[PDB]
Design a protein around this ligand. Structure first.
Ligand SMILES: N=Nc1ccc(S(N)(=O)=O)cc1
Ligand SMILES: [Zn+2]
Length: 257
């Protein structure tokens, strides 16, 4: 099945998922000179005060921190969004080296990693129904660069030894995702897709301009995870990013002048 290797990676995905060559695929390169400030964008509201984390899971492609989304507890509103989007999970994409790992790029610059906070539109009742709609999901993307440690990330980093291999999970309650945000909420936005199979074209992307800084030691611990299951030959979980896809008939809008 699909992955990030030579034999099952992004260049192969179109065979099982023909939408891979579609009209609104993600990620994309953000050309900062071509992105236009949009005054019609309303203020972006990240309301994570009552977020209730449950569990962390190695799914063989990345690790997901999962949230209780049975009520409006952690939500994203405003900006390009109509209505309320509920946080369901976050995960990261990262590289084998500090010079690659992000999915989105900014004037062709690749960051060391990218955080995706995944939200679904509550008008569709559940995330499974939402992902079948053009305005079903909103993903908040945050770049990671290597520098100073991110204190709010360390609790994630410390649990990774317990979920080394595919299918392993651990309790992960009382994690505050507000500790992963940068100071500024300036962003770019465009209509796109999931960046992994099934590549469904159901995502409003909101990509923050300001990266967060994480330490070399923090990212090195991401790179000790395994794509493989327990007892199987070790394949380090690195370079789990899809490269930039054609922008086609899309405009990237900026929230800032
Ligand atoms: N669980 N399905 C998915 C959710 C988010 C993404 S991404 N990478 O586009 O944020 C991919 C798949
Ligand atoms: Zn992602």
């Amino acid at each position: 099945h699909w992955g990030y290797g030579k034999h099952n990676g992004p260049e192969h995905w179109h065979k099982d998922f023909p939408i891979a060559k579609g009209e609104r695929q993600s990620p994309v390169d953000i050309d900062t000179h071509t992105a236009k400030y949009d005054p019609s964008l309303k203020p972006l509201s990240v309301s994570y005060d009552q977020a209730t984390s449950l569990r962390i899971l190695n799914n063989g492609h990345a690790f997901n921190v999962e949230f209780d989304d049975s009520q409006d507890k952690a939500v994203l509103k405003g900006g390009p969004l109509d209505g309320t989007y509920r946080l369901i999970q976050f995960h990261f994409h990262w590289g084998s080296l500090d010079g690659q790992g992000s999915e989105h790029t900014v004037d062709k610059k690749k960051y060391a990693a990218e955080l995706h906070l995944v939200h679904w539109n509550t008008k569709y009742g559940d995330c499974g129904k939402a992902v079948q709609q053009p305005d079903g999901l909103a993903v908040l993307g945050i770049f990671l660069k290597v520098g100073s440690a991110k204190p709010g990330l360390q609790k994630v980093v410390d649990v990774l030894d317990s979920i080394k291999t595919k299918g392993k999970s651990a309790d992960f309650t009382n994690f505050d995702p507000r500790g992963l945000l940068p100071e500024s909420l300036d962003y770019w936005t465009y209509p796109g897709s999931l960046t992994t199979p099934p590549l469904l074209e159901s995502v409003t992307w909101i990509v923050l301009k300001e990266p967060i800084s994480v330490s070399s030691e923090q990212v090195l611990k991401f790179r000790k995870l395994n794509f493989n299951g327990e007892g199987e030959p070790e394949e380090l979980m690195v370079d789990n990013w899809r490269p930039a896809q054609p922008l086609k008939n899309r405009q990237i809008k900026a929230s800032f002048k």
